[PDB]
Design a protein around this ligand. Structure first.
Ligand SMILES: C[C@@H]1C[C@H]2[C@@H]3CCC4=CC(=O)C=C[C@]4(C)[C@@]3(F)[C@@H](O)C[C@]2(C)[C@@]1(O)C(=O)CO
Lengths: 10, 257
């Protein structure tokens, strides 16, 4: 549900 | 002539903020298109997604941010992105146009005529407002940087964050940094009190501005028949933000009653 934002944050 | 060199950091938060502030992005605007509110809105959203990605990279570098629970980090960015985007649009519009024109990017400046097209009028008034306040108050770059960090930390889940104590600490560091930025101007104690009051009133006023803008963002996002496009990054954030907004979960952290 938050793949893109989670990817950036990691 | 001088040698190439990176600017000298100092052990202060504002010095770090200055070095991590993302560079102003160009839209890569194809000005050959005809003038139309729907086309403009899509163009603004595509620029917005690029700015939001830059803002996420900026937030990760803010001391302590990455130490908050990952869920807190996502939530803070989902709740605050519009604040960060509108405040920076306000800064560009103030520095480049004294708050008279919407300066989205150096190659995307929306003039009075375009701002007054039928379906641009209302949203542009809301978008330009904060720029007029930055102009009125003659906000400095150091004040702006501190205030912009406070906007990342101005909206939280009603039930609290997972790393609440750390968040409160970080937020207070930037409140203090704003005071230092005001004080560095060299005013007397009374003037410092007055200016801090005025700038925190400005911060508080951002919530009602953002309410006006999210109403457009969410409606243009949801009503696919309007054919206004959003890039993936933004679409994902908005998809996740709407349920929190509509359930009344987004709690504003106001300085004043
Ligand atoms: C009125 C709203 C508020 C607008 C946003 C205001 C903040 C902003 C500043 C920028 O530098 C670039 C894009 C954004 C982030 C934005 F301009 C676009 O995304 C279009 C936007 C959502 C809006 O125009 C629409 O809903 C259009 O669909």
């Amino acid at each position: 549900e938050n793949a893109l934002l989670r990817y950036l944050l990691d | 002539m001088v040698p190439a060199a990176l600017p000298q950091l100092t052990p202060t938060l504002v010095s770090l903020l200055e070095v991590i502030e993302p560079e102003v992005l160009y839209a890569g605007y194809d000005s050959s298109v005809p003038d139309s509110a729907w086309r403009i809105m899509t163009t603004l959203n595509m620029l917005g997604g690029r700015q939001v990605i830059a803002a996420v990279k900026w937030a990760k570098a803010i001391p302590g941010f990455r130490n908050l629970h990952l869920d807190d980090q996502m939530t803070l960015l989902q709740y605050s992105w519009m604040f960060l985007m509108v405040f920076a649009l306000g800064w560009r519009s103030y520095r480049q146009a004294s708050g008279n024109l919407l300066c989205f990017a150096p190659d995307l400046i929306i003039n009075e005529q375009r701002m007054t097209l039928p379906c641009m009028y209302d949203q542009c008034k809301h978008m330009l407002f904060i720029s007029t306040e930055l102009q009125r108050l003659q906000v400095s770059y150091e004040e702006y940087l501190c205030m912009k960090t406070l906007l990342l930390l101005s909206s939280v889940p009603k039930e609290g964050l997972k790393s609440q104590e750390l968040f409160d600490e970080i937020r207070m560091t930037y409140i203090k940094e704003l005071g230092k930025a005001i004080a560095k101007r060299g005013g007397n104690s009374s003037q410092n009190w007055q200016r801090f009051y005025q700038l925190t009133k400005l911060l508080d006023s951002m919530h009602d501005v953002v309410e006006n803008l999210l109403s457009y963002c969410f409606q243009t996002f949801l009503d696919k028949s309007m054919s206004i496009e959003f890039p993936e990054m933004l679409a994902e954030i908005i998809t996740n933000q709407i349920p929190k907004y509509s359930n009344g979960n987004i709690k504003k952290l106001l300085f004043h009653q």
